[PDB]
């Protein structure tokens, strides 16, 4: 059904979300769960689409969406998975966490349609 949406209307969303499911299913097929890919996920993404991105606007938009999605994924969507808690949860005890996030992995479930 066309009214269902989330098929072509949101090209940026579909283009970004596909990166998550495709890259995850690929690595789980190889190993199981690579994890640890905050900047890496965006990094390879940009390097893959940079050839089709002939306009600065596109890149800025793609990076905005990819970043927003990851940020949402780790919060609003809450489809992210982490091993520990005390090493990734700021405030309360006043954890350091100045280096980087311990373990970061995403659930292949999500809430997209496509």
């Amino acid at each position: 059904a066309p009214k269902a949406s989330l098929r072509l209307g949101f090209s940026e969303y579909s283009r970004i979300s596909n990166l998550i499911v495709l890259h995850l299913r690929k690595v789980e097929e190889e190993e199981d769960e690579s994890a640890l890919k905050r900047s890496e996920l965006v990094n390879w993404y940009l390097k893959e689409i940079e050839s089709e991105i002939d306009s600065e606007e596109e890149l800025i938009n793609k990076k905005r969406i990819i970043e927003k999605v990851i940020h949402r994924l780790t919060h609003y969507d809450h489809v992210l998975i982490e091993l520990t808690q005390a090493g990734l949860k700021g405030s309360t005890e006043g954890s350091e966490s100045y280096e980087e996030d311990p373990y970061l992995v995403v659930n292949p479930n999500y809430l997209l349609e496509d």
């Binding site: 940009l46 991105i53 600065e56 606007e57 890149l59 800025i60 990076k63």
Partner: peptide, 29 residues
């Protein structure tokens, strides 16, 4: 070209990208 560059760290790569498509003609022949 854009207001409030989201994630300057990831977007900084664009400052060099703009130069790339500047010296190299990407215009479809």
């Amino acid at each position: 070209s854009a207001l409030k560059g989201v994630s300057q760290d990831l977007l900084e790569r664009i400052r060099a990208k703009e130069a790339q498509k500047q010296l190299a003609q990407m215009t479809r022949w």
